[PDB]
Amino acid sequence: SGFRKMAFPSGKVEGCMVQVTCGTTTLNGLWLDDVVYCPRHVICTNPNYEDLLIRKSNHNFLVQAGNVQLRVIGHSMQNCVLKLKVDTANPKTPKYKFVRIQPGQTFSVLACYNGSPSGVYQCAMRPNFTIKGSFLNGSCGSVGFNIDYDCVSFCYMHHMELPTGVHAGTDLEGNFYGPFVDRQTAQAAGTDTTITVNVLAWLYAAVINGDRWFLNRFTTTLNDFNLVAMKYNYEPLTQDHVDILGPLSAQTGIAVLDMCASLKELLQNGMNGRTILGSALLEDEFTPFDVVRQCP
Amino acid sequence: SGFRKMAFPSGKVEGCMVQVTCGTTTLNGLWLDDVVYCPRHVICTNPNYEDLLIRKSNHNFLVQAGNVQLRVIGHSMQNCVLKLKVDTANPKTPKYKFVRIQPGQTFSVLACYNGSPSGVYQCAMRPNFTIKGSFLNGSCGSVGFNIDYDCVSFCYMHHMELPTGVHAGTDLEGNFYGPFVDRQTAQAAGTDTTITVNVLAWLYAAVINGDRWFLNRFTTTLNDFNLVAMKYNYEPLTQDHVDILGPLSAQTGIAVLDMCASLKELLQNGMNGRTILGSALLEDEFTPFDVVRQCP
Ligand SMILES: CNC(=O)c1cc(Br)cc([N+](=O)[O-])c1N[C@@H]1CCCC[C@@H]1NC(=O)c1cncc2ccccc12
Ligand SMILES: CNC(=O)c1cc(Br)cc([N+](=O)[O-])c1N[C@@H]1CCCC[C@@H]1NC(=O)c1cncc2ccccc12
């Protein structure tokens, strides 16, 4: 029993974190085989990054893996990431993939400073392609990931904090999530929405954990629920969402559109002083997969 | 910016997790130097554990570290933990300590099944000496820990789930936290209370992160605040608590008894539909140390 914001064990990623310094700028890099990946803004001092990199050489990059200095033998840019070829393959390289995630999906973040891991937490990619992380100066180059069997799927590299305190970054191919750029502009997070399928998944987790007070005998139609969703700035629920919630609905015996009638009531009436899984708000940062992981 | 339930990077503990089997019972053990620590209930089939262990031999214990079988060359009991001496020292043993924690303190939990780590999360030791974990059948022997510089301070080994779904266990010397025993009885979690110094720490974290709506111009006395605390089932605030909150009060310029007047108002009036650090409840599972870790 119980339901926590649960990250993947971070060891396989800890063994890949290094420190990258260029000039007076230090941040984190990801060392996989003989390449170190890091944000290209490490080379900054409205820049043209192609010009900035042409003016650099391998010896301008200091890469440290714990106590060991790695010798850079090549450098190149891939979108907003720099690839530093080093003369040593990381012996701790896990089986890995570079995957790009969808808004509404979750991942673990290994926050790192000066190449040294500091902490691990779970995050969701918001509909507006920001993440509500916890990051300080020096955290750039920290990565987000999921782990399946022995395989690390890297999905996020940290680049910046926006004015509202939320975070923006790239996939590991250097392509930003969302309409953001690695320069100082007035860019800001756009309007957001609540991830409906995740709220439903979390209500199923609550039922599995014995919270039942919000249940009722009613069912709704998909169309009528989506009318309520749009009033409350919730994403539309699709038939694919209903299908994805199938296992949790079978586990609890509560049909998806039955649970949707509960969510409609919670949206229109609130909780009347009660809580669900220790929260007085509707939580939307757990996917159906996340619930089954802790509540099979 | 941002504030998350943030665990310590779990790699140093992942390398210590093994599978212990006795008879048909499997759970997790902690392998440090040439000893594997695990819950003594692995030897059960109102037991007398001294009798149960006298009837066992080394060959009754199967210990597997990933794919490698470790040969047990000695067995002994230490309170509610079994110590299995093995013929190989763990080459991945970190610098470590066995520390016992206080109610109100926090730690990271590496949930494990069949000797294999599944997830990492942060937990607090409740005033009633339970933890609100996330644990399933097979999770016994999972451990809780904090990490400081290179040193893992192990503080918790998981033994059982109580009827309300919360969790109970021992320190790594085998001594239970709280009035619990490793037998089936009608034991249940006792009354709990809210950890006041942690709520205050989290209000300081909120201010550091730009949430200021609950602040006011008033201050209270310690005695008058503690009258309100006892009405709302909050722990008394001590002068030592006030001293511990010193750094956060200096960082924000908000005196501790100034913030106490805010907490009094929140307790008496609620939040009027507003939120603090993404919560509509007063959070008490972050220590002052946890706040400074993410909000220096
Ligand atoms: C704060 N400001 C921005 O983060 C920022 C804002 C914009 Br608009 C554009 C960029 N840009 O172009 O990269 C930014 N990156 C900064 C400047 C270039 C180098 C990296 C810098 N950021 C960090 O060090 C950082 C990361 N995370 C959380 C933080 C919390 C507090 C302070 C700093 C950070
Ligand atoms: C559920 N019941 C108890 O956990 C229990 C309750 C009491 Br009262 C006393 C003991 N006792 O004496 O050890 C208990 N341990 C169980 C019996 C002895 C072996 C270990 C057993 N527990 C787990 O496998 C377990 C751990 N965590 C979360 C779980 C969630 C669901 C199912 C099982 C667990």
Author numbering:
A (entry chain A), B (entry chain A): 1 to 45, 51 to 301
What do the study authors state?
The coronavirus 3C-like protease (3CLpro), also known as main protease (Mpro), plays a crucial role in processing two polyproteins (pp1a and pp1ab) encoded by the virus RNA genome. Inhibiting the catalytic activity of 3CLpro has been proven to be an effective strategy to block coronavirus replication. In this study, we have identified mutations in SARS-CoV-2 3CLpro that confer resistance to WU-04. To understand how these mutations affect the WU-04 sensitivity and the catalytic activity of 3CLpro, we solved the crystal structures of these mutants and aligned them with the crystal structure of the WT 3CLpro.
We have also solved the crystal structure of the M49K/S301P double mutant in complex with WU-04 and found that residues 45–51 have poor electron density, similar to that in the M49K structure. Crystallographic analysis indicates that the M49K mutation destabilizes the WU-04-binding pocket, impacting the binding of WU-04 more significantly than the binding of 3CLpro substrates. WU-04 in the M49K/S301P structure and that in the WT 3CLpro structure are colored cyan and yellow, respectively. The S301P mutation alone slightly increased the IC50, but in combination with the M49K mutation, drastically increased the IC50 to greater than 5 µM. Interestingly, though the M49K/S301P mutant showed stronger WU-04 resistance than the M165V mutant, its binding affinity to WU-04 was higher than that of the M165V mutant, indicating a resistant mechanism beyond the decreased WU-04 binding.
